[PDB]
Amino acid sequence: GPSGIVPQLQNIVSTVNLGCKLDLKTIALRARNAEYNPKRFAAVIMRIREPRTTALIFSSGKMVCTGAKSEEQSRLAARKYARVVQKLGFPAKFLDFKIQNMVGSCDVKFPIRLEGLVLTHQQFSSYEPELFPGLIYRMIKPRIVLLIFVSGKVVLTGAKVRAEIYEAFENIYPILKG
Template identity: 30%
Template sequence: MNIENCTCVFKLLPGIQRFSSENFLKIARNGINTEYNPKRFHSIIMRIRHENNRTTAALIFQSGKVVMTGVPNIKSARTMAARVSKRLKAMIRASNIIQLCEIRIINLRITNIVGSYRHKNRVAIESIYMHFKQFQQQQKRGQVRKAENRQSKELFKRIISVIYDPTIFPALRIKIKNEGIKREASCLIYISGQVIATGVMCNTQMKHLFDNIILPLLLNFPRL
């Protein structure tokens, strides 16, 4: 799986400290590549351009919380957070605000990773959908046959739901049990073999998801 982008969260102010409404408005007015419309959304939207014409968006809230989307990879998360912090400090200086506490990066963590993969063959996503529905019905009736489900039984047991309606969306949508955390992982599988996975928070979880669920599905259900 290739990591496409990440979502990160961190704080700029310690404890319960927050920007006053007046200071927050002053900061927003002195930003470069920033947008602030409190009637539409209660955060300063800061856009940071970097190589390959990609853009990371940072949502800065009055509480000092920052949500960054479009971070290229896990390794660059701290670098992008440092750029947000540096730019915000410049905005505060330009606003002539006497800041009582130091602006710094606090509790930076990855909250979501989006990965993609292109399989070499086309995928029979209709067969995955039908086999999963049959497995669910047999499981409810207690009629799951070991001989017939040797390859797919353990695989389907870790899948929460499968949705496929080509009149609404062209991909197979799968929700998967994400071991170690309470949240679910999601996966889109297209007939072409294109796969998009999300809902994991580290490379280890992404690798586990791909090796144990996504790749076996692709290999077991080729489009003939």
């Protein structure tokens, strides 16, 4: 069962369609937090402090946001960006919001011998300290990928909802323990 350590999400990724054509130069010109360098890439970057997120605009009518601590918070950040775009004069809308990715991390408070983890589970766990100290572990139920380290801390990524990260942690905990 659980050890009292609940995995905590550190990032969310989400996108939404603005539903209208936009001009990147106009956004960069009229907005304070907007960043635009067409010589490098054809998109505008947006930053706000509450939520603590980073997002982008594209002329084809697309918006992406990331950096939030929860999917509801990511939606709030996206809607704030949509409001900013609307008040800048574009006829934007908040259409087809989708959560794309969310990351989590946890710990077990005991060492994990990665040698044992690889030599019992070589079929889906890949271990290669030289380029990456941690052990890389992919899984099917749910479609998640993990990073397991010597200290016992684990990073979880690829989920759409916190339930997936929780159940992934519960699935791996008996493997981590023994």
